[PDB]
């Protein structure tokens, strides 16, 4: 009997090793095997070896083509089931969510004869298993192979699959597939038909035979991780590119960043909601609640203490046709807000992962078709968006991964990185708002400054009495009428002798100086050539006069004196030969506004006191401020005397003004001083004056150097005045210096220099003599040598030096005869 043969074989180990360990004839092994084995095989061992080697080679060839994973592991599971004489095997795939581990199913009830259709499980049929329930959880958590002799005696065993699948288990054997120190999957064999329990040989075969499925799963896991990391890197790079494009508000930045990376997320829909950031309410909004007219707020509150209020929601529909929608005021029944998950996320600040949203109890869902397209929510993942101050500014929620699988650890890491990067970028929005507010404040301050400096309607009537003579406002007057009015009021060319080197303003009022300033412009002839409006000219002169502060020395009188000295240098000194009319226009205009807003202190005091002037401007603190203020006044339409000028002429005038105003700095004059000497020396040998005038009229750089030198000479012109005018101005500068020294002593608590203290007020003649010897003499001697018409300046300078020296010797004799004679 066949059963008799089988039993006699199995209960007789002595004979079994003998007959099967026999040299079998080649034709016998040829007939025994199906089809025909090659000549190599001669025994059962060789036949089994050849067959198994061929099967393993075919399996390797299958893995070679691409990443199949499922098919290869199914075939090796069938082979292992045949080898082990079991009847069931399964594949449980490791997955991590919310920081906890799970063991889903990927292959179930694989039998020695089966097809991939009846063992593969769709994502909607997996039996998830926590890391505590069941033997599989123990295997996953202990990272060790587990053999169970009897299931009924196993403490950590779960029967959950038995009722569902209607099966009874009597033996279990499992092992974790590892990719280093992380579990990838577990493979389990159930209900050993071979015998009562798993023998040691079956354990050894199970351990050895699985070194190939481990390789396949390792390849699959490595490919998945590489793809995920590449996608995360691309997302971060694109977000960084979009964030740094410009400075905008939070909403624009968030929308750009979220829209640009819509292809790297692989999601059906995702919505972004923005939370209000109002910390406190105003008095007129808290009054009704405190008076019992309205009920106090009672609802969810963020951990910062604010009120959850989504004031804007942006939707991204991607499954069908792209439809980006922005909701101004999100209704309470919005398809995203109605779940209640974003509100809970805002209250807590937790990353929430949902596997089966319809079968949920904490948050309610629609549990049906959201839209006519029949898109049903199946997987949700929500994260907060916090800045560097740990304040939630929004909530991002993602739905329905495209591939049809629940959100795993990699997706959580990717989207958390995206939201983390977007949270830090809020610092750009704060800087944007702060910049806008600063700009608005500066513009307001500039307007308030402009109102006070400008000349109003009533003030202009002191110079343009059109309200009575014409009975009309100056704006509506005609050019001819304005000129006729101006002719009478304006002083005559020789009334105030504005052409001389000895002009004194001590006998004229401020209005007289303004009228003389207008008369200089009329004398230069630029009024009729450039079509300068006369009302604009008068208003500009009055505004410039008002711009100067009411300080001791650097008041409007100093500016007018410098302008008049430049005018007489151009006209009386015959330095106009080298310059055109536009250059003279710009020169006079720059001379008027060279000390427009002097505060009464020099540059060094600005540097030492950390004034904002010393911070905004680095090299020439005050001299750059005056130019900026003067150009600010000229930018106004009503005060722009450059209204009718070509673009090239305007740029030329602006460049000349920039050169002239900054040139008044004494340090720059000291540095670039020998170039003027070289130019003078070149002039002295060229030829008669006509050829030199012809040549120098074309050299731009030499003309600019002479321009700067004339600026410097005009700035210090107060010394080349007659001794009556001198010795009176010299007291004003001393008073200003003494005031600055007092400010230095009280505020900065530093001892002033011997020039800048009231105690050494008897050494003024010596200091004046030293200043004359050091600074003025070089420039005035060089200008006298250049043009012989400027000799009176040098003569008066030498006379003033003689007078100051005589005073110094008198003081020295007095102090000598006191100290070294009276005491001794």
């Amino acid at each position: 009997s066949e059963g008799q043969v089988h039993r006699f074989l199995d209960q007789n180990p002595g004979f079994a090793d003998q007959y099967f360990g026999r040299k079998l004839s080649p034709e016998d092994v040829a007939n025994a095997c199906e089809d025909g084995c090659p000549e190599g095989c001669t025994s059962f061992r060789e036949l089994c070896q050849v067959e198994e080697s061929a099967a393993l080679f075919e399996l390797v060839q299958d893995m070679q083509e691409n990443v199949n994973m499922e098919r290869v592991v199914f075939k090796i599971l069938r082979r292992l089931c045949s080898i082990l004489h079991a009847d069931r095997c399964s594949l449980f795939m490791y997955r991590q969510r919310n920081g906890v581990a799970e063991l889903a199913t990927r292959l179930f009830s694989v039998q020695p004869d089966s097809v991939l259709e009846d063992c593969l499980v769709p994502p909607d049929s997996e039996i998830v298993f926590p890391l505590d329930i069941g033997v599989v959880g123990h295997v996953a958590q202990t990272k060790k192979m587990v053999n169970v002799q009897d299931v009924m005696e196993c403490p950590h065993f779960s029967s959950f699959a038995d009722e569902l699948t209607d099966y009874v288990t009597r033996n279990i054997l499992a092992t974790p597939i590892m990719n280093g120190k992380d579990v990838v999957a577990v493979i389990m064999a159930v209900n050993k038909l071979d015998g009562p329990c798993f023998t040691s040989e079956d354990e050894d075969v199970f351990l050895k035979y699985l070194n190939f499925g481990t390789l396949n799963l390792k390849i699959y896991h490595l490919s998945y991780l590489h793809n995920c990391e590449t996608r995360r890197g691309q997302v971060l790079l694109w977000s960084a590119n979009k964030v740094f494009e410009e400075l905008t508000d939070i909403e624009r930045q968030f929308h750009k960043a979220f829209y640009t990376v819509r292809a790297y997320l692989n999601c059906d829909r995702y919505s972004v909601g923005l939370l209000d950031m109002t910390k406190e309410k105003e008095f007129f909004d808290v009054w009704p609640v405190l008076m019992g007219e309205a009920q106090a707020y009672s609802g969810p509150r963020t951990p910062d203490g604010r009120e959850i209020l989504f004031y804007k929601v942006i939707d991204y529909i991607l499954h069908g046709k792209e439809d980006i929608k922005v909701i101004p005021s999100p209704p309470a029944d919005h398809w995203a807000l109605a779940s209640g998950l974003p509100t809970y996320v805002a209250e807590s600040g937790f990353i929430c992962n949902i596997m089966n949203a319809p079968a949920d109890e904490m948050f309610n869902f629609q549990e049906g078709p959201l839209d006519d397209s029949g898109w049903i929510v199946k997987n949700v993942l929500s994260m907060p968006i916090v800045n560097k101050k740990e304040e939630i500014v929004g909530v991002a929620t993602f739905y329905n991964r495209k591939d049809g699988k629940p959100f795993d650890e990699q997706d959580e890491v990717l989207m958390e990185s995206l939201t983390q990067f977007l949270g830090w970028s809020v610092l750009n929005t704060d800087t944007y708002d702060k910049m806008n507010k600063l700009e608005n404040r500066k513009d307001i301050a500039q307007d308030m400054v402009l109102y006070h400096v400008r000349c109003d309607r009533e003030e202009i009537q002191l110079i343009l009495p059109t309200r009575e003579r014409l009975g009309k406002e100056p704006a509506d007057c005609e050019e001819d009428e304005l000129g006729k009015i101006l002719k009478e009021v304006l002083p005559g060319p020789a009334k105030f002798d504005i052409y001389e080197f000895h002009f004194s303003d001590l006998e004229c009022t401020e209005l007289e100086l303004v009228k003389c300033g207008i008369q200089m412009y009329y004398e230069l002839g630029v009024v009729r050539k450039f079509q300068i409006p006369q009302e604009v000219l008068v208003r500009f002169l009055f505004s410039v006069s008002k711009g100067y502060r009411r300080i001791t020395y650097h008041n409007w009188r100093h500016g007018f004196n410098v302008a008049q000295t430049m005018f007489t240098l151009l006209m009386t000194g015959k330095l106009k030969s080298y310059y055109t009319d536009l250059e003279a226009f710009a020169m006079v205009t720059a001379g008027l506004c060279h000390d427009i807003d002097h505060r009464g202190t020099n540059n060094l005091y600005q540097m030492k006191s950390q004034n904002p002037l010393a911070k905004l401007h680095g090299s020439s603190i005050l001299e750059r401020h005056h130019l900026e203020f003067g150009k600010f006044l000229l930018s106004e339409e009503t005060l722009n005397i450059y209204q009718n000028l070509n673009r090239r002429q305007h740029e030329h005038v602006i460049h000349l003004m920039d050169i002239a105003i900054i040139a008044t700095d004494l340090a720059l004059y000291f540095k670039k001083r020998t170039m003027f000497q070289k130019i003078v020396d070149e002039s002295k040998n060229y030829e008669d004056r006509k050829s030199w005038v012809e040549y120098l009229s074309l050299e731009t750089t030499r003309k600019e150097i002479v321009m700067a030198m004339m600026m410097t000479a005009c700035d210090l012109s107060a010394i080349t005045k007659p001794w009556e005018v001198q010795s009176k101005v010299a007291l004003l500068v001393a008073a200003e210096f003494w005031e600055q020294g007092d400010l230095e002593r009280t505020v900065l608590d530093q001892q002033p220099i011997p020039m800048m203290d009231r105690n050494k007020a008897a050494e003024l003649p010596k200091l004046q003599v030293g200043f004359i010897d050091f600074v003025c003499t070089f420039v005035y001697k060089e200008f006298s040598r250049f043009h012989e018409e400027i000799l009176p300046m040098f003569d008066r300078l030498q006379n003033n030096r003689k007078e100051w020296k005589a005073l110094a010797d008198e003081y020295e004799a007095k102090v000598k005869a006191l100290e070294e004679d009276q005491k001794k």
């Binding site: 919310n98 920081g99 906890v100 889903a104 199913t105 292959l107 179930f108 009830s109 009846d118 063992c119 593969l120 499980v121 769709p122 994502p123 909607d124 049929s125 997996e126 039996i127 998830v128 298993f129 926590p130 329930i133 069941g134 779960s158 569902l164 699948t165 209607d166 807590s348 600040g349 937790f350 990353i351 929430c352 992962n353 596997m355 089966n356 319809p358 904490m362 907060p384 916090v386 740990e390 629940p406 959580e412 958390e416 983390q420 020099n602 060094l604 680095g618 090299s619 004494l666 340090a667 000291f670 540095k671 220099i753 011997p754 020039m755 800048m756 030293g770 200043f771 050091f774 600074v775």
Partner: protein, 69 residues
């Protein structure tokens, strides 16, 4: 067909209770920037302007007396 696991509709699990959620990632990536060595030299200065060019020491002293320095 009845499927391998005999389960339809959605994933089943033998775990009941309130779900747990991850806290955040707010420690691994978190005076500003002062512990970095070599940090002292870096920083914009307010003395990047040349005081004066090649001048005699007596003239340099004289410039200070007149506040032009």
């Amino acid at each position: 067909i009845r499927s391998a696991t005999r389960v339809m509709g959605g994933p089943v699990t033998p775990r009941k209770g309130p779900p747990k959620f991850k806290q955040r990632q707010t420690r691994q990536f978190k005076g500003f920037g002062d512990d970095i060595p070599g940090m002292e030299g870096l920083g914009t200065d307010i003395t990047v302007i040349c005081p004066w060019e090649a001048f005699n020491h007596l003239e340099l002293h004289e410039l200070a007396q007149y506040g032009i320095i």
